[PDB]
């Protein structure tokens, strides 16, 4: 109150373990009196192909196609594609925005990479020369909310997965901090799927709790030192 | 060289830099003698989303859709969509996987992320127990070429973006090393809207001539040392 927040989530399956952490942050951030707006990127079948049909009318350079310099021009020119037109408007408004998804592959899931790669376009969400703290959305909060297959051990320094820290970087220092956000800690909720059903009640009601004073966080130093470092 | 090479290529643009590495590959390595495919993605329109319309036989919980499962599954009853087992055939044959891609959001475009999410399934790239070291693509090799718009003293330690090796990590290790590829050293060719015309040139060469003598590398050893230090 008065915030808004935009959820983006990528899952299939509406009873997933990652449906039920989308449901719950819409019931508890709906309970608080905030404003809330979900991308259901699935359902939306959300393009996550970065291509010419981006940009409507016609092209700054229709000799040699490069994407960065026409979606650039093409954001400036009010000329986007209506789906990431409408995007940025939610993330326009956005105060916080959470990403609710499975790790795929130690990243988010291809629908919301195309998301991430075609929503958040120069001009928008940062300029050449114009980021991480030059960088256009600064004053906004995000927060990645992964669910994974692996254990919480597998994913130590010398766990064979790494510290789950060394996967975030692309996103959050790569992504959320380059477009300027302010980071928030990630939640992680470790391999659901190797239950048990008491556990993984356990860990729906950690993020519920954790969303009850979600505005009183401070963001992460989103650094090289935070990620790698001691 | 009697070896098979898989180029899968990221890149809208066929006079793109991305391009031209992709044909001083395609050329050189010919030239050598070696067989030698392309899977151009974007010429193929290839679908990067990971959804129910993988699999079409009878799904193993109709209930509760839950994609590795389902696409496991599938693996075993040959009832994956084609275009997925038209991949797996490329792979299943290459002895080198080289990816040729700009640098999208630290990592690799949403349309390439959708090969690696919906080709390397389980039953096919892994298993559980079957991973890192005991992959199922194990004896192959991969090696990513990767272009930026950030230069080489951007992608340093102390450089705003930190080092280059740091955003490999979830694709060589994460991807690559946990379906059991060897993995050569990336090639990385650092901004090159930036660079000079001779630049550019000796960036396209630099390539061309590491690949006369490809057979010969080692692997890198894909660890967390190799990738963060200390
Ligand atoms: C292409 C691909 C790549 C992957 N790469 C990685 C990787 O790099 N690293 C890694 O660690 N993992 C990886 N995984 C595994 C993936 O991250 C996990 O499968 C995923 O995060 C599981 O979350 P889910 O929502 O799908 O679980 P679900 O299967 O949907 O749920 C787990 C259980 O919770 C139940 N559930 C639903 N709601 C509730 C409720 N409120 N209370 C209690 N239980 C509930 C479900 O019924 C289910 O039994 C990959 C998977 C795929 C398909
Ligand atoms: C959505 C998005 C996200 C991005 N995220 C990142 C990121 O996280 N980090 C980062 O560093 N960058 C990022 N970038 C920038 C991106 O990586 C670069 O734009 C891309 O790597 C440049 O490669 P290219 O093939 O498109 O170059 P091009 O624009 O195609 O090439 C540059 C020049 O080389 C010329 N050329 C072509 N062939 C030859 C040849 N044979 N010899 C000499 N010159 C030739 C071309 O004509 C052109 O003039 C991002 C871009 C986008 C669009
Ligand atoms: C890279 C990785 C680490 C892990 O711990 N689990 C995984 C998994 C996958 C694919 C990849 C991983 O599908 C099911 O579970
Ligand atoms: C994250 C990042 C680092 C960088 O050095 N350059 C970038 C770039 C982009 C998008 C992101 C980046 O579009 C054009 O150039
Ligand atoms: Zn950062
Ligand atoms: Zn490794």
């Known amino acids: ?45 959300f393009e996550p192909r970065a291509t010419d049909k981006d940009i409507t009318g016609t092209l700054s350079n229709p000799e040699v196609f490069n994407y960065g310099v026409e979606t650039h021009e093409a954001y400036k020119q009010r000329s986007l594609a209506s789906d990431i037109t409408d995007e940025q408007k ?17 990243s988010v899931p291809a629908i919301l990479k195309g998301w991430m790669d075609r929503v958040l376009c120069q001009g928008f969400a940062f300029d050449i020369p114009g980021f991480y703290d030059s960088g256009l959305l600064q004053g906004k909060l995000a927060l990645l909310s992964v669910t994974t297959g692996g254990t919480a051990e597998m994913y130590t320094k010398t766990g064979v997965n790494g510290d ?27 391999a659901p799927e190797i239950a048990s059903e008491e556990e ?11 969303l009850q004073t979600i505005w009183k966080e401070e963001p992460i130093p989103c650094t090289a030192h935070w990620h790698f470092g001691q």
């Not at 789950?164 to 470790?190: D, E, M, N």
């Open 1 to 45: 109150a008065g915030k808004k927040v935009l959820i983006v989530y990528a899952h299939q399956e509406p009873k997933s373990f990652n449906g039920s952490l989308k449901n719950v942050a819409v019931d508890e951030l709906s309970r608080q009196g905030c404003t809330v707006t979900v991308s259901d990127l699935y359902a939306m079948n």
């Open 164 to 190: 789950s820290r060394y996967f975030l970087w692309p996103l959050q220092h790569g992504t959320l901090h380059f477009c300027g956000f302010k980071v928030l800690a990630p939640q992680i909720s470790f």
């Open 90 to 106: 939610k993330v326009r408004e956005a105060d916080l925005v959470i990403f609710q998804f499975p790790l795929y592959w130690f």
């Open 200 to 210: 993984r009640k356990g860990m729906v009601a950690a993020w519920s709790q954790r």
